[PDB]
């Protein structure tokens, strides 16, 4: 409310609400990815676990944004959550490509909000993103890039064998 | 898939997917309730905590359903998640009335799925609901009923004072 | 001194000295608030403790600024400390309103110094404020806002009773 | 207030308020002394620490007086705090001479308040000063005297070397 | 690579490579300083240790930059490392003056990279420098300034004696 | 210096300085190798770790030589460090071949210095090399030879798969 709000623009308030929606939609996508890899006809437990953990991380990102919104005196507004873009996600390689595209989209939304906060001279917002989101995102994207490279070197050789080895020897199970 | 599926009707498969949607929408509603009570102009920490815990419980209910869907060889299908029915939730009394209506709707969906499973002679489904959902729901609704009665006796007396006392002396903070 | 000073403008040096004065004056105001609530004819121990703790926090803020001033090679200059604006502070509600006004004034001074540092391309100063002051201030103002709302809901009901309950059940004693 | 006040003269009440001002001004002077010795072009950490500790002790003395004022039913009244008498404090010798002058002034104010309390037959006040202030002050002044003598014997020999040795081998760092 | 790179300019990539070179050259200079003070005809163990520790810190700074370069999808490129500017480093005073000049040069390179990142709207880079380099550098330069002042006060008095005392009583051995 | 130097030829002094340069250049090469394998488009963590550890070992070898130089009364002289011979290092096989060539070059420089020390009847130098370098080098080269053989047997079969297996099952991560 108005009792505490200080130096917090309506444009930032609205963008924060949009970003919450994007994080929750990412969480939902990761939930779908995770349960796909737990199907009896897919059955890659390490891949399932990887995406389930990301679903949790994105949900937590949204909750941190909502906490911040209240700390600044903005008002959280929730919208419909669009279902994930696919019902089936293909191979580990297809899934990891889809995940890195998703993360780059989230990262772009973070960068755009940082630029808005810079333009509106809102240093608390800029710091908040720097401290809790931007470096986490860079580290995650690097990890996904590393995974992509390793999956590609394996399935180029021999696809089924390669996918099993990656799940067994890289991913946690 | 077809490799494991046994005695698992398409009608039950579809209803399970619908029930996942209903649990996730309940989780989302509770997320909105929780953050409403964390607003600086509402500021009832115990109420916030109560609804945040319920958001987690409903999400976990959905995840258990999705696990079961895969164990039976059904295929999870995700739909859009409708936003919560309100943006602001009124007083603790208004919120607790809305929550018990929501839980009765979930309970009815559980009972309807149990009846379908009975009709289709699917004892695993019926047991699964009995063991993980039906008694949890009855206990939760009883707790909400108890809360409603206590809130009503307090705010009938003196509304602001009453709401504070309930949050301080009944709810966990 | 000149031996270490690098990228540290005279405008920032002077503003830092002014900010030290503002923090020390805030500390002094909180000392007066705290001892007011320890009077035998006021006697709200939890309120006394709350403001005494804030006096300590603001003094520590000033000491951190003075440490930073020396680390950058600026020179601390001390001015007279103006006495607090009131000798008696009214009710818990009056006191908490006065405190949030004071904190918003401090927050504005922080934001103005951050803007100056941005304009002078002094990233160390900007980081220092972000890391040690801006988020602490936002969190404090949110907490005071929450308190204000709870005090208002209580004393609207029944003023003396309400003030006692807040001190007993919200504030630490 | 009047509810508890007994055998507590208006003259003593006023003098106690004056003494609080003198202690807080002493604390402020010691804060300036301490940060002077932390300058990069002074850089005597042990001297800095010595005066910072005294700033804390004098602040605590003021807080004890304010507590006593309330225990007797007097009313604390705060005045402006005059800035310290110097912006730069010279050598360790200059600083220690200034500190002992300050302490003798505080001690004289304590003795004058004790005499007033004796004249007004206020044994609680006299005891309070004896038990919490007078012996502490005598011990501090003796310690400062000892320091002065040691600094003088060192800087008479060789000023820069002497000041370093005193800071390293007498003062705590 | 291109798979992960996002919002990372070629100008920043190149400057990061240059900064790695500057840190490694600083590390090398400190290695030379450290072993100079371990010569039998110099023999100041505490001074040796001080510069050896700085060699390690600068190497670690370079490694952190190289890690960051890879996390952003840039490509590390290594150049020749220029030998230190001197073969013999004079007295402790001469050495500490040379070290503070070196650190101010590094600090300027950090500030210039921060300005470039600000201009290119690269908040991750700006945060990275703020969080890992800028405050460390300010603290180090302050410590070197303090040392310089203490060395100057000692060797003004009596040069050989003064240098020994500083090494024994200030520096760690 | 001349105060301690005994049976330490100028030819050995100079060769020791050259050997320090060769060790530091080896360390630098290993730093480049290590960070190459940490690229998102290479992404072999175990290989990265292997070369990073060797960078540390070679740096430590140089520091031991510099310590010895001072213990004998020689004077360390530092030269420019040439950049590594390649900017990109190819596959694990290419990298391990380059590393064994580098180690054989270092080993030859050690053997040549031992021969010089033998010819100059400097038993301390000969012992120092025997005790700290020659056996370490033989053991390292044997380990690299073993690795080469295992990498060759794997990538002859199936290159991408083979390189992944070696990194996962032989190298430490
Ligand atoms: Cl809608
Ligand atoms: Cl749709
Ligand atoms: Cl004045
Ligand atoms: Cl006044
Ligand atoms: Cl070259
Ligand atoms: Cl050269």
Cβ pair F163, F44 in contact under 8 A:
yes
Q: Is D129 helix (H, G, I), strand (E, B) or coil?
A: helix
CA distance B14 to B11: 5
Q: SS3 string of D106-118? A: HHHHHHHHHHHHH
Please tell me which of the candidates C3, C123, C126 has its beta carbon nearest to residue E145: C3
CA distance F162 to F169: 11
Q: Is A23 helix (H, G, I), strand (E, B) or coil?
A: helix
Q: Would you say the C-alpha torsion C160, C165, C168, C171 has a positive or negative sign?
A: negative
Q: SS3 string of chain F? A: CCCCCCCCCHHHHHHHHHHHHHHHHHHHHHHHHHHHCCCCCCCCHHHHHHHHHHHHHHHHHHHHHHHHHHHCCCCCCCCCECCCCCCCCCCHHHHHHHHHHHHHHHHHHHHHHHHHHHHCCCHHHHHHHHHHHHHHHHHHHHHHHHHHHHHHHHHHHCHHHHHHHHHHHCCCC
What is the dihedral angle through the alpha carbons of C10, C12, C13, C14, rounded to the nearest 10 degrees? 90
Treating both helix axes as pointing N-terminal to C-terminal, what angle do E10-36 and F45-71 enclose, rounded to 10 degrees? 30
Q: Is A167 helix (H, G, I), strand (E, B) or coil?
A: helix
CA distance C37 to C163: 12
Are F1 and E39 an interchain contact pair (Cβ–Cβ within 8 Å)? Answer: yes
Residue indicated by tokens 């006697």: C43
Question: Which residues have a Cβ under 8 Å from the Cβ of C10 and sit 6 or more positions away?
Answer: none
| Total CB pairs under 8 A between chain C and E | 43
Within 10 A of C71 (CB to CB), how many other CB atoms are there?
Answer: 21
Task: Fill in the DSSP letter of residue C82.
Answer: P
Are C6 and E131 an interchain contact pair (Cβ–Cβ within 8 Å)? Answer: no
Residue indicated by tokens 């083979």: F162
C neighbours by CB contacts (3+ pairs under 8 Å)? A, B, D, E
Question: Which residues have a Cβ under 8 Å from the Cβ of E163 and sit 6 or more positions away?
Answer: E44, E91, E92, E93, E151, E154, E155
> Would you state the structure tokens that stand for residue D5, as one six-digit string?
């006040």
Residue (of C138, C142, C51) closest to C92 by Cα position: C51
Which ligand places an atom closest to the C-alpha of F86? 5
Are C104 and A7 an interchain contact pair (Cβ–Cβ within 8 Å)? Answer: no
| Rounded distance from Cα F29 to ligand 6 centre (Å) | 20
Whether chains A and C touch (3+ CB pairs under 8 A) is answered by: yes
This structure was determined by X-ray
Task: Fill in the DSSP letter of residue D81.
Answer: B
CA–chain centroid gap for B9, Å, is 25
DSSP sequence for C25-39: HHHHHHHHHHHHTTS
- For chain E, give the longest Cα–Cα distance: 63
Residue C114's H or E segment, with its range, is: helix C92-119
- Shortest distance between the Cα of F158 and any Cα of chain A, in A, equals 6
- Shortest distance between the Cα of A24 and any Cα of chain E, in A, equals 22
- For chain B, give the longest Cα–Cα distance: 63
Treating both helix axes as pointing N-terminal to C-terminal, what angle do E135-157 and C45-71 enclose, rounded to 10 degrees? 60
CA distance B158 to A42: 60
Are E138 and C71 an interchain contact pair (Cβ–Cβ within 8 Å)? Answer: yes
Task: Fill in the DSSP letter of residue B14.
Answer: H
| Rounded distance from Cα D1 to ligand 4 centre (Å) | 24
> Would you state the structure tokens that stand for residue E27, as one six-digit string?
């590390």
- Shortest distance between the Cα of F161 and any Cα of chain E, in A, equals 21
- Chain C positions touching A1 (Cβ under 8 A) are 145
CA distance D168 to E12: 46
Are C153 and B160 an interchain contact pair (Cβ–Cβ within 8 Å)? Answer: yes
Cβ pair B28, A78 in contact under 8 A:
yes
CA–chain centroid gap for F99, Å, is 8
Q: Is B132 helix (H, G, I), strand (E, B) or coil?
A: helix
The reported resolution of this PDB entry, expressed in Å, is 1.6
Residue (of C130, C138, C136, C135) closest to C114 by Cα position: C130
Q: What is the CA radius of gyration of chain D?
A: 18
Q: Does C79 touch chain E (CB under 8 A)?
A: no
Residue (of D88, D89, D100) closest to D143 by Cα position: D100
CA distance F102 to C65: 53
CATH code 1.20.1260.10 for D10-170: yes
Please tell me which of the candidates A100, A104, A114 has its beta carbon nearest to residue E123: A114
- Shortest distance between the Cα of C57 and any Cα of chain D, in A, equals 14
- Chain E positions touching A138 (Cβ under 8 A) are 71-72, 124
CA–chain centroid gap for A166, Å, is 22
Residue to test with chain C: of E145, E147, E149, E153, most C Cβ within 10 A: E145
CA distance E107 to E19: 11
Are B81 and A28 an interchain contact pair (Cβ–Cβ within 8 Å)? Answer: yes
Beta bridge partners of B106: none
Are C153 and B161 an interchain contact pair (Cβ–Cβ within 8 Å)? Answer: yes
Q: Does E104 touch chain C (CB under 8 A)?
A: yes
CA distance C79 to C94: 29
CA distance D60 to D66: 10
Q: SS3 string of chain E? A: CCCCCCCCCHHHHHHHHHHHHHHHHHHHHHHHHHHHCCCCCCCCHHHHHHHHHHHHHHHHHHHHHHHHHHHCCCCCCCCCECCCCCCCCCCHHHHHHHHHHHHHHHHHHHHHHHHHHHHCCCHHHHHHHHHHHHHHHHHHHHHHHHHHHHHHHHHHHCHHHHHHHHHHHCCCC
D110: left (phi over 0), alpha (psi -120 to 50) or beta: alpha
DSSP sequence for D16-78: HHHHHHHHHHHHHHHHHHHHHTTSTTT--HHHHHHHHHHHHHHHHHHHHHHHHHHHTT-----
D5: left (phi over 0), alpha (psi -120 to 50) or beta: beta
Cβ pair D149, D170 in contact under 8 A:
no
CA distance D135 to D119: 21
Cβ pair B141, B107 in contact under 8 A:
yes
- Chain F positions touching A152 (Cβ under 8 A) are 160
- Chain E positions touching D163 (Cβ under 8 A) are 153
Q: Is B81 helix (H, G, I), strand (E, B) or coil?
A: strand
CA distance C155 to D11: 38
Q: Is B149 helix (H, G, I), strand (E, B) or coil?
A: helix
Q: Does F81 touch chain E (CB under 8 A)?
A: yes
CA–chain centroid gap for F92, Å, is 17
Give Cα separations from C166 to A104, C151, F110 (angstroms): 48, 7, 79
Helix ranges (DSSP H) in chain A: 10-36, 45-71, 92-119, 123-129, 135-157, 159-169
Give Cα separations from E164 to A120, D169, E95, E161, F45 (angstroms): 56, 15, 15, 5, 48
Cβ pair B68, B60 in contact under 8 A:
no
Q: Would you say the C-alpha torsion E117, E121, E123, E127 has a positive or negative sign?
A: positive
> Would you state the structure tokens that stand for residue C161, as one six-digit string?
């009773």
F neighbours by CB contacts (3+ pairs under 8 Å)? A, E
Within 10 A of B152 (CB to CB), how many other CB atoms are there?
Answer: 14
Give Cα separations from C5 to B159, C69, E137, F103 (angstroms): 60, 10, 12, 47
Q: Does E154 touch chain D (CB under 8 A)?
A: yes
Please tell me which of the candidates C118, C138, C148 has its beta carbon nearest to residue A124: C138
DSSP sequence for A71-92: HTT------PBPPPS-S---SH
């Amino acid at each position: 409310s108005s009792q505490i709000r200080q130096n917090y623009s309506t444009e930032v308030e609205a963008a924060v609400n949009r970003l919450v929606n994007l994080y929750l939609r990412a969480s939902y996508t990761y939930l779908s990815l995770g349960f796909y890899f737990d199907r009896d006809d897919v059955a890659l437990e390490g891949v399932c676990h990887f995406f389930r953990e990301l679903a949790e991380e994105k949900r937590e990102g949204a909750e941190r944004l909502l906490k911040m919104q209240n700390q600044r005196g903005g008002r959280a507004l929730f919208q419909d959550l669009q279902k994930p873009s696919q019902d089936e996600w293909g191979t580990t390689l297809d899934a990891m490509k889809a995940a890195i595209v998703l993360e780059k989209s989230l990262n772009q939304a973070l960068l755009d909000l940082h630029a808005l906060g810079s333009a509106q001279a809102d240093p608390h917002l800029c710091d908040f993103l720097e401290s809790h989101f931007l470096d986490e995102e860079v580290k995650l994207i690097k990890k996904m890039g590393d995974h992509l490279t390793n999956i590609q070197r394996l399935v180029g050789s021999q696809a089924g064998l390669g996918e099993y080895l990656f799940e067994r020897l890289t991913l946690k199970h």
